[PDB]
Amino acid sequence: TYNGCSSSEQSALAAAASAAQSYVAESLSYLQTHTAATPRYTTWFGSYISSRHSTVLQHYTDMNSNDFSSYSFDCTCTAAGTFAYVYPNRFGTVYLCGAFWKAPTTGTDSQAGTLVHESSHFTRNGGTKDYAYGQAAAKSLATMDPDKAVMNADNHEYFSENNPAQS
Ligand SMILES: *[C@H]1O[C@H](CO)[C@@H](O)[C@H](O)[C@@H]1O
Ligand SMILES: [Zn+2]
């Protein structure tokens, strides 16, 4: 259900939800077929170790079972610095803010990518936190503290967006 969303916002959300589902699907597949260190993995999740790979694999397995198109969306927030937000314990509802409408459907810091970021926050999906924001900080987190990287929402978003594309 939509709450406080204009017609244009509903249309953008519909496209973003479908793209986010695709992002999660492709990301899950990647994690299932790559069971050793690769550029795309280490860049966002740090040094490859089975434990952490299992952690992210679980997150995407859970998110893949989510139906993004059936999520409830709320467009009342007007915070320009925030893309969106959710309550980890209240699954299925995403609250969109100002920056969301200025973001492209797909790509880096995209609407679709933001939904992946927010979905990862739900406890049912792994309950990621926000230890770092942005590609620069996310990459730094992956190198310096991989344990937090696999529990950081933006690292999941960037791994999924994969832009620039990495093998
Ligand atoms: C992440 O780090 C690994 C190093 O183990 C590379 O394989 C990859 O290119 C990326 O920089
Ligand atoms: Zn977040």
Curated annotation (Swiss-Prot):
Keywords: Disulfide bond, Glycoprotein, Hydrolase, Metal-binding, Metalloprotease, Protease, Secreted, Signal, Zinc, Zymogen. Glycans are attached at residue 42. GO terms for molecular function: metal ion binding; metalloendopeptidase activity. Zn(2+) binds at residues 117, 121, 130. It is found in: Secreted. The record marks 133 as: Transition state stabilizer. The active site is at residue 118. Disulfide bonds join 5-75, 77-97. GO terms for cellular component: extracellular region. Its main location: secreted. The keyword GTP-binding does not apply. One of its GO terms (biological process) is proteolysis. Belongs to the peptidase M35 family. This is Peptidyl-Lys metalloendopeptidase. The lineage of its organism: Eukaryota, Fungi, Dikarya, Basidiomycota, Agaricomycotina. The chain holds residues 182 to 348 of 348 of the full protein.
